Amino acid sequence: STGSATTTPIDSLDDAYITPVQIGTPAQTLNLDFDTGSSDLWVFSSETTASEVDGQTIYTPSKSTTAKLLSGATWSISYGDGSSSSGDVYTDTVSVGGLTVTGQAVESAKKVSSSFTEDSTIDGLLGLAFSTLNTVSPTQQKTFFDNAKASLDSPVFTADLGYHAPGTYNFGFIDTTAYTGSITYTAVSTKQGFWEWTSTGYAVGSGTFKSTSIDGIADTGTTLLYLPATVVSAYWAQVSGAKSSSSVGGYVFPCSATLPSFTFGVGSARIVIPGDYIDFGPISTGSSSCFGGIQSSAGIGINIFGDVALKAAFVVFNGATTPTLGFASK
């Protein structure tokens, strides 16, 4: 089997991408944030505290003839950005782009933090990291990909995120028309539960490539590119007037600037992020100070190849017995 679904930016900055997901019988379609940095499939639901729902589409398990309460199971998650959610668990039929999993754990939110309430466009998350990170207790549950992978033609999924445009998540096959050149594969460590890999270096604009190992995670659920402070300083030094602002929370730059590209290494291959992908617009409406898309990881504890980096590439998440990551230009 295979599946293919279009993923769409939630706003004009590509802050996140939503993909339609069919849950239950008859189908209830919710727009979920596919997140390769986490491993819970959770949804706004008929059980969510009413004051914490503001425009989202909800899953109502009582209206699904295939929903079954997973007795005794609870879940609770906190994300790297400080947001969180928690609730109970149903199993139900879940389909993405024509690919169907029966008995998928669907984590129904009873509580969500304010940042979720305030984003009416995201109806929940679909985690695509390794199932060892799933938060369901007392019996940990499998991700959608883990449940589907034995049935897939090939045990892979691909992320092809658009710049200011829709893109595609595919399951079970590699669309050879979706990228240019070849795909360069690189080793993955699953020891922390993430798609963790080591970049071979970077360049700023037309500058020389610096060979240096940068360990980090491929994370579709994070907007920006978070890298070591040395690397980030070298980038922003090439933008006149750019500075790190403690009050804003990162590097800002004059909105009148033209940004240089940023290149990262994948083995001997190179992925180029155009300068325009690094512009996240005014810090507040009407400001001439703009927020940068490359930021320091120094306060995180891990480097994160988020959407800014991933949308410059066609990315293969190879879930074979020994997982690997693949990157191609497009």
CSV table of C-alpha atoms in Angstrom, one decimal:
chain,number,residue,atom,x,y,z
A,1,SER,CA,0.0,0.0,0.0
A,2,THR,CA,0.9,3.7,-0.3
A,3,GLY,CA,-0.6,7.1,0.7
A,4,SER,CA,-0.2,10.6,-0.6
A,5,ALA,CA,-1.5,13.8,1.0
A,6,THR,CA,-1.0,17.5,0.4
A,7,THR,CA,0.3,19.6,3.2
A,8,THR,CA,-0.6,23.3,3.3
A,9,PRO,CA,1.1,26.2,5.2
A,10,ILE,CA,-1.2,27.6,8.0
A,11,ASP,CA,-0.2,31.2,7.3
A,12,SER,CA,1.9,33.5,5.0
A,13,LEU,CA,5.1,32.8,7.0
A,14,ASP,CA,5.0,29.0,6.7
A,15,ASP,CA,4.8,28.8,10.6
A,16,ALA,CA,3.5,25.2,10.3
A,17,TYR,CA,1.9,22.9,7.8
A,18,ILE,CA,-1.5,21.1,8.1
A,19,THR,CA,-2.4,17.8,6.4
A,20,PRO,CA,-6.0,16.4,6.3
A,21,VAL,CA,-6.5,13.1,8.2
A,22,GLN,CA,-9.6,10.9,8.2
A,23,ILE,CA,-10.5,9.5,11.7
A,24,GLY,CA,-13.4,7.2,12.5
A,25,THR,CA,-16.4,5.8,10.7
A,26,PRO,CA,-18.0,7.8,9.1
A,27,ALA,CA,-14.8,9.8,8.5
A,28,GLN,CA,-14.2,12.9,10.6
A,29,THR,CA,-11.5,14.9,8.8
A,30,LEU,CA,-9.2,16.9,11.0
A,31,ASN,CA,-6.2,19.0,9.8
A,32,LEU,CA,-3.2,17.8,11.7
A,33,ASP,CA,0.4,19.0,12.1
A,34,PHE,CA,2.7,16.1,11.0
A,35,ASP,CA,5.6,16.2,13.4
A,36,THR,CA,8.8,14.1,12.9
A,37,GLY,CA,9.9,15.4,16.3
A,38,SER,CA,7.2,13.7,18.4
A,39,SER,CA,5.3,10.4,18.5
A,40,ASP,CA,1.8,11.1,19.7
A,41,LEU,CA,-1.3,11.4,17.4
A,42,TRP,CA,-3.5,13.7,19.5
A,43,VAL,CA,-6.6,15.7,18.5
A,44,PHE,CA,-9.0,18.3,19.8
A,45,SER,CA,-12.1,16.4,20.7
A,46,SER,CA,-15.6,16.5,22.2
A,47,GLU,CA,-13.8,15.9,25.5
A,48,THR,CA,-11.6,19.0,25.3
A,49,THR,CA,-12.4,21.7,28.0
A,50,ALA,CA,-14.8,24.0,26.1
A,51,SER,CA,-13.0,27.2,27.0
A,52,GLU,CA,-9.8,25.8,25.4
A,53,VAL,CA,-11.4,25.2,22.0
A,54,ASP,CA,-11.5,28.3,19.7
A,55,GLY,CA,-12.4,27.3,16.1
A,56,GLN,CA,-10.7,24.0,15.8
A,57,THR,CA,-12.4,21.0,14.3
A,58,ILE,CA,-13.0,18.3,16.9
A,59,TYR,CA,-13.1,14.5,16.9
A,60,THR,CA,-16.2,13.1,18.6
A,61,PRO,CA,-15.6,9.4,19.3
A,62,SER,CA,-19.2,8.7,20.2
A,63,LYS,CA,-20.1,9.4,16.6
A,64,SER,CA,-17.6,6.9,15.2
A,65,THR,CA,-18.8,3.3,15.0
A,66,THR,CA,-15.2,2.0,15.0
A,67,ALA,CA,-14.0,4.0,18.1
A,68,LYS,CA,-13.2,2.1,21.2
A,69,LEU,CA,-12.0,3.5,24.5
A,70,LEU,CA,-8.5,2.2,25.4
A,71,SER,CA,-9.4,1.4,29.0
A,72,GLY,CA,-7.1,3.0,31.6
A,73,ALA,CA,-4.8,4.8,29.1
A,74,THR,CA,-3.8,8.4,29.5
A,75,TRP,CA,-1.3,10.7,27.8
A,76,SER,CA,0.4,13.9,28.6
A,77,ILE,CA,3.0,15.7,26.5
A,78,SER,CA,5.2,18.9,26.7
A,79,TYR,CA,6.9,20.2,23.6
A,80,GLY,CA,10.2,22.0,23.2
A,81,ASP,CA,8.4,25.3,22.8
A,82,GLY,CA,6.7,25.1,26.2
A,83,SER,CA,3.3,24.0,24.9
A,84,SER,CA,1.5,20.9,26.3
A,85,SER,CA,-1.7,18.8,26.2
A,86,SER,CA,-3.2,15.7,27.8
A,87,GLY,CA,-6.1,13.4,27.9
A,88,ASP,CA,-7.4,9.9,27.3
A,89,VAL,CA,-7.1,7.4,24.4
A,90,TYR,CA,-9.3,5.7,21.8
A,91,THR,CA,-8.4,3.3,19.1
A,92,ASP,CA,-10.0,4.0,15.7
A,93,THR,CA,-9.5,3.8,12.0
A,94,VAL,CA,-7.1,6.5,10.7
A,95,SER,CA,-6.5,7.3,7.0
A,96,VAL,CA,-3.9,9.6,5.4
A,97,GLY,CA,-4.0,10.2,1.7
A,98,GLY,CA,-5.6,6.9,1.0
A,99,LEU,CA,-3.5,4.8,3.4
A,100,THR,CA,-5.6,3.2,6.2
A,101,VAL,CA,-4.5,2.0,9.6
A,102,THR,CA,-7.1,0.2,11.8
A,103,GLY,CA,-6.7,0.2,15.6
A,104,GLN,CA,-4.6,3.4,15.7
A,105,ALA,CA,-4.3,5.1,19.1
A,106,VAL,CA,-6.1,8.4,18.8
A,107,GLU,CA,-5.2,10.5,21.9
A,108,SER,CA,-8.2,12.7,22.8
A,109,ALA,CA,-7.3,16.0,24.4
A,110,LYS,CA,-9.0,16.9,27.7
A,111,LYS,CA,-6.7,19.9,28.2
A,112,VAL,CA,-4.5,21.9,25.8
A,113,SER,CA,-2.2,24.8,26.5
A,114,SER,CA,-3.0,28.3,25.4
A,115,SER,CA,-0.8,28.3,22.2
A,116,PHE,CA,-2.9,25.4,20.8
A,117,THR,CA,-6.2,27.1,21.7
A,118,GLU,CA,-5.0,30.3,20.0
A,119,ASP,CA,-4.2,28.5,16.7
A,120,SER,CA,-7.5,27.8,15.2
A,121,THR,CA,-5.9,26.2,12.1
A,122,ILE,CA,-4.3,23.1,13.8
A,123,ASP,CA,-6.7,20.4,15.0
A,124,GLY,CA,-4.0,18.2,16.6
A,125,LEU,CA,-0.6,16.6,15.9
A,126,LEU,CA,0.4,13.4,14.1
A,127,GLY,CA,3.8,12.3,15.4
A,128,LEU,CA,6.3,10.6,13.1
A,129,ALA,CA,9.3,10.2,15.4
A,130,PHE,CA,10.1,6.8,16.9
A,131,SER,CA,7.4,5.1,19.0
A,132,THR,CA,9.7,4.9,22.0
A,133,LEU,CA,8.8,8.6,22.6
A,134,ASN,CA,5.0,8.0,22.7
A,135,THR,CA,3.6,9.2,26.0
A,136,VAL,CA,0.6,6.9,26.5
A,137,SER,CA,0.6,5.2,29.9
A,138,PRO,CA,0.6,2.5,31.1
A,139,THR,CA,0.9,0.9,27.6
A,140,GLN,CA,2.9,2.9,25.1
A,141,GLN,CA,1.3,3.1,21.7
A,142,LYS,CA,2.7,3.0,18.1
A,143,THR,CA,2.8,5.9,15.7
A,144,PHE,CA,0.7,5.9,12.5
A,145,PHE,CA,3.8,5.1,10.5
A,146,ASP,CA,4.9,2.2,12.8
A,147,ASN,CA,1.4,0.7,12.4
A,148,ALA,CA,1.4,1.1,8.6
A,149,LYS,CA,4.9,0.2,7.8
A,150,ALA,CA,4.5,-3.6,7.4
A,151,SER,CA,1.7,-3.0,4.8
A,152,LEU,CA,3.6,-0.3,2.9
A,153,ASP,CA,5.3,-1.1,-0.4
A,154,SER,CA,8.5,0.3,1.1
A,155,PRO,CA,8.9,1.2,4.8
A,156,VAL,CA,9.5,4.9,4.1
A,157,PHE,CA,7.7,8.3,4.2
A,158,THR,CA,8.8,11.5,2.5
A,159,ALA,CA,8.4,15.1,3.3
A,160,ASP,CA,8.3,17.7,0.5
A,161,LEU,CA,7.4,21.0,2.2
A,162,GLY,CA,6.7,24.0,0.1
A,163,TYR,CA,8.0,27.6,0.4
A,164,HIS,CA,4.9,29.7,0.6
A,165,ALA,CA,3.1,26.9,-1.2
A,166,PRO,CA,1.6,23.5,-0.6
A,167,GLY,CA,3.7,20.4,-0.5
A,168,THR,CA,3.3,16.6,-0.1
A,169,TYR,CA,3.7,13.8,2.5
A,170,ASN,CA,4.0,10.4,0.8
A,171,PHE,CA,4.0,7.0,2.6
A,172,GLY,CA,5.4,3.8,1.1
A,173,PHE,CA,7.1,5.1,-2.0
A,174,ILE,CA,9.7,7.6,-3.3
A,175,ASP,CA,8.3,9.9,-6.0
A,176,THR,CA,11.3,10.2,-8.4
A,177,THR,CA,9.7,13.1,-10.2
A,178,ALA,CA,9.7,15.3,-7.0
A,179,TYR,CA,13.4,16.1,-6.7
A,180,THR,CA,16.5,16.9,-8.9
A,181,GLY,CA,19.8,15.1,-8.9
A,182,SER,CA,20.2,12.2,-6.5
A,183,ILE,CA,19.2,11.5,-3.0
A,184,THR,CA,22.1,11.4,-0.5
A,185,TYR,CA,21.4,9.1,2.4
A,186,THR,CA,23.0,9.6,5.9
A,187,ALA,CA,23.0,7.6,9.1
A,188,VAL,CA,20.4,8.0,11.9
A,189,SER,CA,20.7,7.5,15.6
A,190,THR,CA,17.4,6.5,17.3
A,191,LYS,CA,18.9,6.6,20.8
A,192,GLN,CA,16.9,9.7,21.7
A,193,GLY,CA,13.8,8.7,19.8
A,194,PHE,CA,14.4,11.3,17.0
A,195,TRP,CA,15.5,11.3,13.4
A,196,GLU,CA,18.9,12.3,14.6
A,197,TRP,CA,21.7,12.7,12.1
A,198,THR,CA,25.0,14.5,11.5
A,199,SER,CA,25.4,17.3,9.0
A,200,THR,CA,28.9,17.6,7.4
A,201,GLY,CA,29.1,21.4,7.6
A,202,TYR,CA,27.8,24.7,6.3
A,203,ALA,CA,28.4,27.8,4.2
A,204,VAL,CA,27.0,31.3,4.4
A,205,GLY,CA,26.0,32.9,1.0
A,206,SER,CA,28.8,32.5,-1.5
A,207,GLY,CA,31.4,31.8,1.2
A,208,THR,CA,33.6,28.8,1.5
A,209,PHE,CA,32.2,25.6,3.0
A,210,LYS,CA,33.2,24.9,6.6
A,211,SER,CA,33.6,21.1,7.2
A,212,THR,CA,32.3,20.4,10.7
A,213,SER,CA,30.0,17.8,12.2
A,214,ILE,CA,26.7,19.2,13.4
A,215,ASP,CA,24.5,16.6,15.1
A,216,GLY,CA,20.8,17.5,15.0
A,217,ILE,CA,17.2,16.3,14.3
A,218,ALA,CA,15.0,16.4,11.3
A,219,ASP,CA,11.9,18.0,12.8
A,220,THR,CA,8.9,18.9,10.6
A,221,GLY,CA,7.1,20.2,13.7
A,222,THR,CA,9.6,23.0,14.4
A,223,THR,CA,9.4,26.1,12.2
A,224,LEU,CA,13.0,27.4,12.3
A,225,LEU,CA,16.6,26.2,11.9
A,226,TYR,CA,18.3,26.0,15.3
A,227,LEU,CA,22.1,25.6,15.1
A,228,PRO,CA,25.2,26.2,17.3
A,229,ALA,CA,25.9,29.8,18.4
A,230,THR,CA,29.1,29.9,16.4
A,231,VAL,CA,27.3,29.0,13.1
A,232,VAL,CA,24.4,31.4,13.7
A,233,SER,CA,26.8,34.3,14.5
A,234,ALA,CA,28.7,33.6,11.3
A,235,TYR,CA,25.4,33.8,9.3
A,236,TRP,CA,24.0,37.0,10.8
A,237,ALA,CA,27.4,38.7,10.6
A,238,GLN,CA,26.8,38.9,6.9
A,239,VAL,CA,23.6,40.9,7.3
A,240,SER,CA,24.1,44.6,8.0
A,241,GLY,CA,22.3,45.7,11.2
A,242,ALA,CA,21.4,42.2,12.4
A,243,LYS,CA,21.7,41.5,16.1
A,244,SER,CA,20.6,39.1,18.8
A,245,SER,CA,17.9,40.7,20.9
A,246,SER,CA,17.3,39.3,24.3
A,247,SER,CA,14.0,41.2,24.6
A,248,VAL,CA,12.6,39.7,21.3
A,249,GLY,CA,14.2,36.3,21.9
A,250,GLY,CA,16.6,35.8,19.1
A,251,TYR,CA,18.3,37.3,16.0
A,252,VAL,CA,16.5,40.2,14.3
A,253,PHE,CA,17.5,42.1,11.2
A,254,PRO,CA,16.4,45.2,9.3
A,255,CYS,CA,13.4,44.4,7.1
A,256,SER,CA,15.1,46.3,4.3
A,257,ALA,CA,18.0,43.7,4.1
A,258,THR,CA,18.5,41.1,1.5
A,259,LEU,CA,19.4,37.9,3.2
A,260,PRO,CA,22.2,35.5,2.1
A,261,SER,CA,21.6,31.8,1.5
A,262,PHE,CA,22.7,29.2,4.0
A,263,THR,CA,24.1,25.8,2.8
A,264,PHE,CA,24.2,22.7,4.9
A,265,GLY,CA,26.1,19.5,4.1
A,266,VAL,CA,24.6,16.0,3.8
A,267,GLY,CA,27.6,13.8,3.3
A,268,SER,CA,29.4,15.1,0.2
A,269,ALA,CA,26.1,16.8,-1.0
A,270,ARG,CA,24.9,20.3,-0.3
A,271,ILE,CA,21.4,21.7,0.4
A,272,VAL,CA,21.0,25.4,-0.3
A,273,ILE,CA,18.4,27.4,1.7
A,274,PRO,CA,17.6,30.6,-0.2
A,275,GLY,CA,17.9,33.8,1.8
A,276,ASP,CA,14.2,34.5,1.4
A,277,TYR,CA,13.4,31.3,3.3
A,278,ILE,CA,15.1,32.8,6.4
A,279,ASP,CA,12.8,35.9,6.6
A,280,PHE,CA,10.1,35.5,9.1
A,281,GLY,CA,8.8,39.0,8.8
A,282,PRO,CA,8.2,41.9,11.2
A,283,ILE,CA,8.5,41.1,14.9
A,284,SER,CA,5.2,42.9,15.4
A,285,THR,CA,2.7,44.4,12.9
A,286,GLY,CA,4.3,47.5,11.2
A,287,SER,CA,7.7,47.0,12.7
A,288,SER,CA,10.8,47.4,10.5
A,289,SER,CA,12.7,44.8,12.6
A,290,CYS,CA,12.2,41.3,11.2
A,291,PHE,CA,12.7,37.9,12.8
A,292,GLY,CA,15.4,35.6,11.6
A,293,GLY,CA,14.8,32.0,10.5
A,294,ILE,CA,18.2,30.8,11.7
A,295,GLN,CA,18.5,30.9,15.5
A,296,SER,CA,20.8,29.6,18.2
A,297,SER,CA,20.2,26.2,19.7
A,298,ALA,CA,22.4,27.0,22.7
A,299,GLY,CA,19.4,27.0,25.1
A,300,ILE,CA,17.7,23.9,23.7
A,301,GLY,CA,20.2,21.1,24.2
A,302,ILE,CA,19.9,19.9,20.6
A,303,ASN,CA,20.3,21.3,17.1
A,304,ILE,CA,17.0,21.2,15.1
A,305,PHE,CA,16.7,21.1,11.3
A,306,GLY,CA,13.2,22.5,11.2
A,307,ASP,CA,11.0,23.6,8.4
A,308,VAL,CA,13.4,26.4,7.2
A,309,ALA,CA,15.9,23.7,6.4
A,310,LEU,CA,13.6,20.8,5.4
A,311,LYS,CA,11.5,22.8,2.9
A,312,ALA,CA,14.7,23.4,0.8
A,313,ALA,CA,14.9,19.6,0.3
A,314,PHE,CA,13.0,16.5,-0.6
A,315,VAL,CA,13.5,14.4,2.5
A,316,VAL,CA,13.2,10.6,2.9
A,317,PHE,CA,12.5,9.1,6.3
A,318,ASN,CA,13.7,5.5,5.8
A,319,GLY,CA,12.2,3.3,8.5
A,320,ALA,CA,14.0,0.1,7.5
A,321,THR,CA,15.4,-2.1,10.3
A,322,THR,CA,18.4,0.3,10.4
A,323,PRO,CA,16.8,3.7,9.7
A,324,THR,CA,18.4,6.4,7.5
A,325,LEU,CA,17.6,9.8,6.2
A,326,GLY,CA,17.8,11.0,2.6
A,327,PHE,CA,18.1,14.5,1.2
A,328,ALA,CA,17.8,15.7,-2.3
A,329,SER,CA,17.6,19.2,-3.9
A,330,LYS,CA,14.4,20.0,-5.7
